[PDB]
Amino acid sequence: IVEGSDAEIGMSPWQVMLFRKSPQELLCGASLISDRWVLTAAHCLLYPPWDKNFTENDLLVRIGKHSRTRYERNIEKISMLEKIYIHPRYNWRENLDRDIALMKLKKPVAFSDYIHPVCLPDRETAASLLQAGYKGRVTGWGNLKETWTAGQPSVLQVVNLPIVERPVCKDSTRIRITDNMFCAGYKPDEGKRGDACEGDSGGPFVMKSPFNNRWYQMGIVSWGEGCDRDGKYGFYTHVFRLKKWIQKVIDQFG
C-alpha cells in the first residue's frame, strides 16, 4: 500500500495473508468470508504467463495478522487449504476479467478479537455504495512504493480511496475494462494520493454500510499499472457481480 498508514489492531480482522510454503514468502492478500472460506484474486493462484499455477499443498493462509514478517504467536492462525476454486471464466489471457477465487480451509478457523469475517454485499448495498466519489478501504502488506532499494511495511497498511467514474477509469488505460471491474484512487488534481501495490493483490476493498454499520467487501485488489502513478487508478474485482458464482461454489462444496 502506497501512502497509507499502519492499521490499528483488529481494524481488518478479515485480512488474510496468502503465504508460499517454500520459499516462505508473501504472495498476496485475501479475506475471510466465513470460518472455512477465504476469498482472493484468481491471479494470485493462476497466472500462466508467469508460470504460476499453485496447488493447495503449495500454500498456507495466515489469519489474524498485523505484523508482516513476524510469527504472531497466540494471535495469528495458520490454515492449510482443502481446495482452490478459480472462476471458470477468469480471463488470464487478456485483462484479468473475473479475477476471483475461493479457498476452502481444511479446518474451520476460530474467531477471535483478531479474526472475524467480512460481509459480502447484497444487490442493494452494492447499488447504493458503488458510486463515484464514495470511498472504500484497501489493506495489505504489499510494497510501500512502486520503486525502492532493498520499501516494505512492518505492519498491515490501510488506505481509503474513492471509487472513480467509469469513463475516467477507462480513459486512464489501454486495457479493456469490463463490468466485472471498478477502479479507485484520487485524481491528479485532488491533493491526496494512495494505491495498492505489489503484494496487495487479492486483498479486500471494503466499505462500511451507513445503513447497518457493517463492513462489506465490494472489491478484490486486482491490478494496476505501477503504483500510485498520477492519472492511473487501481482496478478491483466487482465482488457483487460475481457473487452468484461465490454462492454456487459455497452451496455445492461447503
Binding site: 510454503k21 516462505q24 513476524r70 510469527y71 495458520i78 492449510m80
Partner: peptide, 12 residues
Amino acid sequence: GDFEEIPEEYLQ
C-alpha cells in the same frame, strides 16, 4: 530470511 520461521507443524 525476511519472514520469521513458522512452526513446523504447519509445514507437514
